[PDB]
Amino acid sequence: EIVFGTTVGDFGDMVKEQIQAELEKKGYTVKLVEFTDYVRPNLALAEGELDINVFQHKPYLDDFKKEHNLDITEVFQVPTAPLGLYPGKLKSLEEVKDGSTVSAPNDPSNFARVLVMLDELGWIKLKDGINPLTASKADIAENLKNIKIVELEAAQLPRSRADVDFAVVNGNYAISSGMKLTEALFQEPSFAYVAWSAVKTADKDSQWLKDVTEAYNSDAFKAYAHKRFEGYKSPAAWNEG
Known part of the structure; x- marks a missing residue:
């Protein structure tokens, strides 16, 4: 056994x-x-x-x-279950504008993951030589696209897609709220x-x-x-x- x-x-x-x-x-x-x-x-x-x-x-x-x-x-x-960037008021990645809003979970570990994802997307640039596991807003060396990150409780993220241009949702809350993971425009790499x-x-x-x-x-x-x-x-x- x-x-x-x-x-x-x-x-x-x-x-x-x-x-x-x-x-x-x-x-x-x-x-x-x-x-x-x-x-x-x-x-x-x-x-x-x-x-x-x-x-x-x-x-x-x-x-x-x-x-x-x-x-x-x-x-x-x-x-x-993956962390994903999902459509909000905007429906595709190249519609991103200077000043576009992105909702994100506000607990420190998930928030760090969001920042790393936005750096991979090229929308922000994080400082070099930082611990990615603890990335915070202080670690943004250059906000390339002047993204405004709207920090919300994780459980609230599925309901934020009317309020922001893109929403980053945790896999567990995406699933429990009826979202399809395949709907994400970008999944955490x-x-x-x-x-x-x-x-x-x-x-x-x-x-x-x-x-x-x-x-x-x-x-x-x-x-x-x-x-x-x-x-x-x-x-x-x-x-x-």
Whole structure:
């Protein structure tokens, strides 16, 4: 038996709908433990109550295992609900004007991700040599297109598209509000916040983990993810697949 821990939602659905049967074909059984918060999964992993968890991105994992002194590590990436720039009052990227408004989530990590995206688009230029994970308005070296960024609560972003020219919406709120991820005009190119699986470090070279990694990178899983999770950001190793 391989004991998976996930949050309730997409990451558990991957286990239940595709990964479980794939690993059954390889001699294993899969036991899914669902968690409703983000603190317990790594602790349960570290105490040996889980063999692997799939819920978090690497910035979160790094901070968590540092602060709790856990001997755990990321293993592989999984398809992840993406941060996207969606149409607002304007309907395409080249309609952007000097002074165009962009709504964005106001929590510091998501806001930093928005700034990095706008820098990739060429609408702003961030200072050089900064930590992209903590980018803030102070780090804008040149506002190329004089964009006005309207900071709102993440949950409010789906309703802002009448108020601003473009809206940056988190994948989770895009999904829960009925938006299609494929509607985004521009999806976050960075992989810095794609979700990873995690294990105890002592287990990182184990045979069962090689088989789990294979299952999460198999052709069957890829086709499943392309149908079930259209628009999600794929693991880098899939080559945009």
